[PDB]
C-alpha cells in the first residue's frame, strides 16, 4: 500500500543515509493512524516522504488564503495556465503545478487524510505523479550542516472523513501552539463597498452610523495609503494615520487597519530608498506579483534591517491605538528567490510574521490575508481562508481565486475544520446592503447563515446608510447562530450541495443545508 522514505511501510525507528542527505525518523502509532516525524541534515532538496496509490477523488488545498480547497478527479488533471501576474498564489513550487496535480499541506479522500503538521522550514506538498500520490518536503536547495526537524506527516484512517480533518487540525494546533482567542471580534470593514474609492468623508459617515450596529472593530482597508510600502503616509482626504486611530477610538471602536507588510511597489519611497531590501533574481529585484497596475516586490525577511523596519512600523501603529491588523499579500514574503541569508523562503516568512506579532503585542488581533496557511499558525489570531467575497454571487467568475461570493463561501465550507484549531476562520465580510449590490436577499441570507453556523468571524462591509431592516435582521440572526461546534457532513461533495450541522450554538443545535448552484438554503434550529 505505501512507501515511507523509499521503503515499505513499517512501524519503528529508522535511518536513511543518502549521498546528499541523512534522515532519522520514526513511524509511530497515534490515535486513528500514524505519524512520521524525525530530523534531517545535508541537502534534502525535494524530499520524498511517502508514496502510495492515488485515489480517484481527492480534496486538495492551495497553500494560501485565496486558493481553492476542493474535490478534484485525480486522474483527469490537466495543468492550468499560470497567470504571470499571480504566479506564486497558485503555487510556491510552480514547476510542479505545471505538470502534476498539487496539494499543499494536506490531501483527503473518503476515509483517509494525509497531512503535514507544520511548515517551519520546508514547504510540505503532495503531487499526483502518474497514478501515485507522493508527499514531499521542499527545502528549496537550502543546506543544513546539522539536523533540523522534519515537518511531521500524519496518515489517518476512519470512515468519518470530517472527524479526520478535525483531528488533523487539532494536531496542527498543538504542533504550532495555535492562537485561538476565546473572544471573536465583530466589526466593520470598508473594502467591499468602497474598494479603492474610500474617502475619510464617507469613513466618518459610517463611523457615526456604526454605533447602531453590534461592531467592536472599525477597520480601514486599502485606500488610505500613499503607496504600497509607505504605510505611514496618507493620500487624498485622509488625515494622519495617528489621527484616524484617535478619531476611531474616540467613537468607541477598536481601530483596525489594513497593510500588505511584506510588499513594496516599484514606485514606493521605501523601495526607492532601499532597493536592496527585496528578494532578488540574478542580483536584480524579483517581481513577487503585479497589482495596483504596478510591479510589486517582496521584502527579504532574512535581513535584520527589514525586520527592524517592520518592528518599528507595527510598534508605532500599536502606540497610535490600532489593535486590529489585517495583514495581506503575505505570500509575497515567502516567494522563492535570493535572500541575504541562506534560509528557506518559509523560514524567512516566519521571521517576518514573528516580528509583527512581537511588535503589536499580545493584546492585538492579527488577521492574516492572502497568506500561506500552515506557516502562519501560532502567530495569526484569524485567517482569511477563502478568496474575496463580492457584492455579486459570481457565476460568471471561475474558480481561479478572483472575487466572487460563491467561491468565497465554498472555501469557508471546505476549510471549516481549521476553525477554532488553527485560528479563527475569516469567511470574508458579510455584505448586507439593499442597494448597490447584485445580491438577492436569498443569497445574502445563505452566505450569512452559513458563516454563523460555521462559528466563523462576522465582519460587515457596507455603506451602512444602505443597510435597512432586512440586513439588520440578517446580521442579528447570524450572531444568534454562533457559538457551536460545526461540522460539514459531506465534505467530499462534488456538486456544491452541503449539509452543515453545529451543536450548542446560541440557538441550540442547528442544521443548514445549502446548494451553491441554485443559491438555495434550508435551516433548522431544533
Curated annotation (Swiss-Prot):
According to its UniProt record, which residues of this chain constitute the active site?
Answer: 328, 388
UniProt effect for mutating residue 329 to A: Increased transglycosylating activity at high concentrations of p-nitrophenyl-alpha-D-galactopyranoside substrate, which could be useful in industry and medicine for the synthesis of different p-nitrophenyl-digalactosides
Q: What top-level branch of life does the organism fall under?
A: Bacteria
Q: How is its activity regulated?
A: Inhibited by hydrolysis product alpha-galactopyranose and to a lesser extent by beta-galactopyranose, its mutarotational product. Inhibited by synthetic cyclopropyl carbasugars.
State how changing residue 221 to A affects the protein, per the record. Less than 1% of the wild-type enzyme activity with p-nitrophenyl-alpha-D-galactopyranoside as substrate at 80 degrees Celsius
GO annotations under biological process?
Answer: carbohydrate metabolic process; glycoside catabolic process
Q: Provide the binding site for substrate.
A: 66, 192, 221-222, 326-328, 369, 384
Reaction(s) catalysed by this chain, per the record, are: Hydrolysis of terminal, non-reducing alpha-D-galactose residues in alpha-D-galactosides, including galactose oligosaccharides, galactomannans and galactolipids
* Annotated consequence of substituting residue 403 to D: Increased transglycosylating activity at high concentrations of p-nitrophenyl-alpha-D-galactopyranoside substrate, which could be useful in industry and medicine for the synthesis of different p-nitrophenyl-digalactosides
Q: How does it assemble?
A: Homodimer.
Please identify the protein, giving its name as recorded: Alpha-galactosidase
User: Organism source for this protein?
Assistant: Thermotoga maritima (strain ATCC 43589 / DSM 3109 / JCM 10099 / NBRC 100826 / MSB8)
The gene for this chain is: galA
Amino acid at each position: 500500500h505505501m512507501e515511507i522514505f523509499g521503503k515499505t511501510f513499517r512501524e519503528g525507528r529508522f535511518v536513511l543515509k543518502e549521498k546528499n542527505f541523512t534522515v532519522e525518523f520514526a513511524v509511530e502509532k497515534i490515535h486513528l493512524g500514524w505519524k512520521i516525524s524525525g530530523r534531517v541534515k545535508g541537502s534534502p532538496g525535494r524530499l520524498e516522504v511517502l508514496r502510495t496509490k492515488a485515489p480517484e477523488k481527492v480534496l486538495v488545498n492551495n497553500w494560501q488564503s485565496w486558493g481553492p480547497c476542493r474535490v478534484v478527479d485525480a486522474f483527469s488533471f490537466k495543468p492550468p495556465e499560470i497567470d504571470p501576474n499571480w504566479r506564486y498564489t497558485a503555487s510556491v513550487v510552480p514547476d510542479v503545478l505545471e505538470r502534476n496535480l498539487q496539494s499543499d499541506y494536506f490531501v483527503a479522500e473518503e476515509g483517509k487524510v494525509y497531512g503535514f503538521l507544520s511548515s517551519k522550514i520546508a514547504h510540505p506538498f503532495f503531487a499526483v505523479e502518474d497514478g501515485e500520490l507522493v508527499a514531499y518536503l521542499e527545502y528549496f536547495d537550502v543546506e543544513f550542516d546539522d539536523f533540523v526537524p522534519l515537518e511531521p506527516l500524519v496518515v489517518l484512517e476512519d470512515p468519518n472523513t470530517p472527524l479526520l480533518l478535525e483531528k488533523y487540525a487539532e494536531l496542527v494546533g498543538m504542533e504550532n501552539n495555535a492562537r485561538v482567542p476565546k473572544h471573536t471580534p465583530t466589526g466593520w470593514c470598508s473594502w467591499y463597498h468602497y474598494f479603492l474609492d474610500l474617502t475619510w468623508e464617507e469613513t466618518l459617515k459610517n463611523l457615526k452610523l456604526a454605533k447602531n450596529f453590534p461592531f467592536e472593530v472599525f477597520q480601514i482597508d486599502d485606500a488610505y495609503e500613499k503607496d504600497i510600502g509607505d504605510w505611514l503616509v496618507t493620500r487624498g482626504d485622509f488625515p494622519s494615520v495617528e489621527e484616524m486611530a484617535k478619531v476611531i477610538a474616540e467613537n468607541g471602536f477598536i481601530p483596525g487597519i489594513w497593510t500588505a507588510p511584506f510588499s513594496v511597489s516599484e514606485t514606493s519611497d521605501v523601495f526607492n530608498e532601499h532597493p536592496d531590501w527585496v528578494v532578488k533574481e540574478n542580483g536584480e529585484p524579483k517581481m513577487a506579483y503585479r497589482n495596483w497596475n504596478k510591479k510589486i516586490y517582496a521584502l527579504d525577511l532574512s535581513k535584520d534591517e527589514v525586520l527592524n523596519w517592520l518592528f518599528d512600523l507595527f510598534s508605532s501603529l500599536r502606540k497610535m491605538g490600532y489593535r486590529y491588523f489585517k495583514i495581506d499579500f503575505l505570500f509575497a514574503g515567502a516567494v522563492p528567490g535570493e535572500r541575504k541569508k541562506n534560509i528557506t523562503p518559509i523560514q524567512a516568512f516566519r521571521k517576518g510574521i514573528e516580528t509583527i506579532r512581537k511588535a503589536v503585542g499580545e493584546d492585538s488581533f492579527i488577521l492574516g490575508c492572502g497568506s500561506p496557511l500552515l506557516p502562519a499558525v501560532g502567530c495569526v489570531d484569524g485567517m482569511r481562508i477563502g478568496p474575496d467575497t463580492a457584492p455579486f454571487w459570481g457565476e460568471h467568475i471561475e474558480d481561479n481565486g478572483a472575487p466572487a461570493a460563491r467561491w468565497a463561501l465554498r472555501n469557508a465550507i471546505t476549510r471549516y475544520f481549521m476553525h477554532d484549531r488553527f485560528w479563527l476562520n475569516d469567511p470574508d465580510c458579510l455584505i448586507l446592503r439593499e442597494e448597490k449590490t447584485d445580491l438577492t436577499q436569498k443569497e445574502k441570507e445563505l452566505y450569512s447563515y452559513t458563516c454563523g453556523v460555521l462559528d466563523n468571524m462576522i465582519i460587515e462591509s457596507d455603506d451602512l446608510s444602505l443597510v435597512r431592516d432586512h440586513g439588520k435582521k440578517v446580521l442579528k440572526e447570524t450572531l444568534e447562530l454562533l457559538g457551536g461546534r460545526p461540522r460539514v457532513q459531506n465534505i467530499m461533495s462534488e456538486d456544491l450541495r452541503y449539509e452543515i450541522v453545529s451543536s450548542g450554538t446560541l440557538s441550540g443545535n442547528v442544521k443548514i443545508v445549502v446548494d451553491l448552484n441554485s443559491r438555495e438554503y434550508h435551516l433548522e434550529k431544533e
